[PDB]
Design a binder for this molecule. Structure first.
Ligand SMILES: [Zn+2]
Lengths: 205, 156, 50, 121, 208
RNA sequence: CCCGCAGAAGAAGCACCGGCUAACUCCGGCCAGCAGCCCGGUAAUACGGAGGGUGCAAGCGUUAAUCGGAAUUACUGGGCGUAAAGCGCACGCAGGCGGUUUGUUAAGUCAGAUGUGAAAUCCCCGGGCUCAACCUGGGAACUGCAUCUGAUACUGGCAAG
RNA sequence: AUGUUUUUUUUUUUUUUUGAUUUGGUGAGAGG
């Protein structure tokens, strides 16, 4: 139910930096980010039409840490919902509790955030929510509870975030350690490199 | 600015007194991400050369296509030889739902959102041609208005 | 330095049409600013006027 | 084709017969080996392919391929067949590692497909 | 084995000889042997130095070698240090007083042998043979060859079934005797086997 | 359901990597074996093992079965000179279709209403289980059938041309 | 007068264009 292996390998495979490590130390120093994993890394022949789409899908999934069935479900939901499908999917992905936490800066990585969520550190509207897939709504305040507020990791995460660009769709307080999910993010607010359309196509086989 | 996609490359033979002389055909298609599209079919003893030739061919004899935003203006059929093709305009987000050679042509053309089936033959060369034909024939609202002696609001 | 005298977000990217840190290495999306870079995306002489 | 014609006599659906009829819409069937033997395949191939004529539970007498390297089967050995045809007249495979048919010896990849338990170390 | 050797057919007319001496039936074989030896030695030594043509010329019980090379600097080394060294060994090989001259080869892309050698080297270091061939052809053309042909043969891309491929550009008349056709050959001793490289370079026609 | 305790602790496999099809190398002789369709005879990315990778993941493969792809029974939506496909040719009952004008009818057709079309299910907006599945409020839908009141271009009936 | 009379895999991927050859203050001395 989770990917427990090497994180940088995934990144290498993808091509890009997936942000699977905190960002204290640059990704180029930790691993050969350009070279693909395994014995046959240096060889890089152009991929197929299907293959590129698949890769794209993987990238997105990897980024958020969502396994396949769940991803499929999300896609379906997006399709069902009104408006642009890929965009909807992206929004849904964002909405995940762990992701939100990460954005806020209470977790160094998304993985860390997820862990925190699991371990009953986070509350959503003053009620302890344990599910990483929990879809956080507009105007839903989300905070660290008083037990987990003393942790050194949390402050480190916050610091890291502060170095990292702040998302417009949230509003977080470092002292209070509570952030308000103000609105579901627009496509423009998210990263431009993610070809959602490819993903959509893949499932529209 | 122009994007160019080699759809297919196929090895073709000519029998001679000695034996078989092999050659390569390259089917490419190029477009500017707007109305302009053009396919090219190049042939040579080696692949890369053939591809280059195809590209060259494509770059000349392009064709303009009226695009309402990211999609087509109305459902359009296009036929050529075996390959008969249907393509239907679709809502933003849906992506290019189309198969093979057909997809490639659409992508370069700068249609982002289509629902497109290739009936009949799916011989890449023919199907791309069919697609092109379909695109070409497809008229815009303004054009139709002009034709009919009316305003755009009269037609809706 | 991010964000010191010679910043990225306040002024512009050192390299032309490149996020100095890492995204956009072609000519398609000139302008996007990810959180990992806190960088604009324009010309090499854009910092001379800013 | 003509609508009237269609009305008169509608369109016949192509009834596709099953290529594994001795199963009778069962995922597997139990059978007893009437005889076990090797057979030579058709052109262009060359081998001694191990196969057993099986009398099934439901009454049919079929012939079932035996996959993997080596097998313990004899006459009067109770085996499970699964369907699948080897590319004359063999339309079924013995399930290795079910009933009397053993798993393949010394196999470490695709183990499931030959009944083999996970190697301990 | 269809074709006549392009150098060999033209030795009387447009091409000259490499070994250029007179000897009676007594000493001729010995001389030839000596030449073979010295040449062999030179090839062994000046492999890294791009060497095209060794011209031996022995008057009056003294051997005069003339090394045509693209880069004299690596053959000479420090001024009269490497050449001198070469000389004594040459002398030893011969059994007579030696004299080494070093001709500087202008335009090593137009010298056929050199090109062949380069191609062989490329093959050895695992490049795409075809790309190498193209480079060879193109470069020569750029330099002002009236034409060039190159041919490579056997175990191309380590393939089980051996074949030959060849690229021509411009005009390369072989039947025309008065054509200056610089022909030469080489052999790439790859992991899969030998790959023989031929190259013809047509400088132009001589009028006399 | 909540609180406390200890300590990374008790918790990852399955299939695949010739092309289709995401993933490649080395070591073991048309045998042993593989196979869904289209390898193996001594350098096998196709057999078996290894290392490396890819895809799924408390599941993963295989088999069986249904629809799909299959516009490959084509109502939507195919064809028949040569690819399968024009009766050897006619007459002709039933059947199908029917030039043009006016009038009338109102069967078909269309419009509106009424009754019904069980609940659940599906779909939309909500609510409740920490989320989800699940449960659940209200709607929409159930393409229909029947009846009543209109419309009369078209098709039909009847009457005259 | 006559030829389906010795078949076996002796196997299908390019270059691609898109961008340039890189040296700031201080002080001293000479020529006109
Ligand atoms: Zn960036």
């Amino acid at each position: 139910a989770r990917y427990l292996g090497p994180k940088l390998k995934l990144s290498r495979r993808e091509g890009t930096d997936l942000f699977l490590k905190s960002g204290v130390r640059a990704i180029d120093t930790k691993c050969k980010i350009e070279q693909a994993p395994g014995q046959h890394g240096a060889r890089k022949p152009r991929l197929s039409d299907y293959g590129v789409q698949l890769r794209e899908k993987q990238k997105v999934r990897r980024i958020y840490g969502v396994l396949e069935r769940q991803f499929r479900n999300y896609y379906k939901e997006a399709a069902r919902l009104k408006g642009n499908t890929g965009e909807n999917l992206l929004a849904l992905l964002e909405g995940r509790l762990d992701n939100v936490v990460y954005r806020m800066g209470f977790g160094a990585t998304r993985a860390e955030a997820r862990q925190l969520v699991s371990h009953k550190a986070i509350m959503v509207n003053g009620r302890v929510v344990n599910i990483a897939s929990y879809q956080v709504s507009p105007n839903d305040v989300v905070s660290i509870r008083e037990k987990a507020k003393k942790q050194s990791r949390v402050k480190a995460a916050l610091e890291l975030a502060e170095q990292r660009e702040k998302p417009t769709w949230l509003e977080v307080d470092a002292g209070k350690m509570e952030g308000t999910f103000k609105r579901k993010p627009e496509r423009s607010d998210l990263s431009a490199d993610i070809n959602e359309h490819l993903i959509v196509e893949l499932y529209s086989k | 600015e122009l994007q160019e996609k080699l759809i297919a490359v196929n090895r073709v033979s000519k029998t001679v007194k000695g034996g078989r002389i092999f050659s390569f055909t390259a089917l490419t298609v190029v477009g500017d991400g707007n109305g302009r599209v053009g396919f090219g079919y190049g042939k040579a003893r080696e692949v890369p050369a053939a591809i280059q030739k195809a590209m060259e061919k494509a770059r000349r004899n392009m064709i303009n296509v009226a695009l309402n935003n990211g999609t087509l203006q109305h459902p359009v059929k296009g036929v050529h030889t075996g390959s008969r093709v249907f393509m239907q305009p679709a809502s933003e987000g849906t992506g290019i739902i189309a198969g093979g050679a057909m997809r490639a042509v659409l992508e370069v053309a700068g249609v982002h959102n289509v629902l497109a089936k290739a009936y009949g033959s799916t011989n890449p060369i023919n199907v791309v041609r069919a697609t092109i034909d379909g695109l070409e024939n497809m008229n815009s609202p303004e054009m139709v208005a002009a034709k009919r002696g009316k305003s755009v609001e009269e037609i809706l | 330095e991010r964000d010191g005298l010679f910043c990225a977000r306040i002024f512009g990217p050192v390299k032309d049409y490149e996020c100095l840190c890492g995204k956009y290495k072609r000519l398609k999306h000139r302008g996007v600013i990810c959180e990992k870079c806190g960088v604009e995306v324009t010309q090499t002489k854009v910092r001379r006027e800013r | 084709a003509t609508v009237n014609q269609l009305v008169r006599k509608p369109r016949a659906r192509k009834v596709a017969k099953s290529n594994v009829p001795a199963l009778e819409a069962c995922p597997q069937k139990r059978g007893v080996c009437t005889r076990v033997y090797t057979t030579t395949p058709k052109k262009p191939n060359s081998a001694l392919r191990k196969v057993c004529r099986v009398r099934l539970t439901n009454g049919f007498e079929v012939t079932s391929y035996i996959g993997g390297e080596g097998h313990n089967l004899q006459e009067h050995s109770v085996i499970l067949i699964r369907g699948g045809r080897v590319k004359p007249g063999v339309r079924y495979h013995t399930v290795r590692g079910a009933l009397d048919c053993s798993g393949v010896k010394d196999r470490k990849q695709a183990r499931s497909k030959y009944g083999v338990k996970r190697p301990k170390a | 084995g269809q074709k006549v050797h392009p150098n060999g057919i033209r030795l009387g007319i447009v091409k000259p000889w490499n070994s250029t001496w007179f000897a009676n039936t007594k000493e001729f074989a010995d001389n030839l042997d000596s030449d073979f030896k010295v040449r062999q030695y030179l090839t062994k030594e000046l492999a890294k130095a791009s060497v095209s043509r060794i011209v031996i010329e022995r008057p009056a019980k003294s051997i005069r070698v003339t090394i045509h090379t693209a880069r004299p600097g690596i053959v000479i080394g420090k001024k009269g240090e490497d050449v001198e060294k070469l000389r004594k060994v040459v002398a030893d090989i011969a059994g007579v007083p030696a004299q080494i001259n070093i001709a500087e080869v202008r335009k090593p892309e137009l010298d056929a042998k050199l090109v062949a050698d380069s191609i062989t080297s490329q093959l050895e270091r695992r490049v795409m043979f075809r790309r190498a061939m193209k480079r060879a052809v193109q470069n020569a053309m750029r330099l002002g060859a009236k034409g060039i042909k190159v041919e490579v043969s056997g175990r191309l891309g380590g393939a089980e079934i051996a074949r030959t491929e060849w690229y021509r550009e411009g005009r390369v008349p072989l039947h025309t005797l008065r054509a200056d056709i610089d022909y030469n050959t080489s052999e790439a001793h790859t992991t899969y086997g030998v790959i023989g490289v031929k190259v013809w370079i047509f400088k132009g026609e001589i009028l006399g």
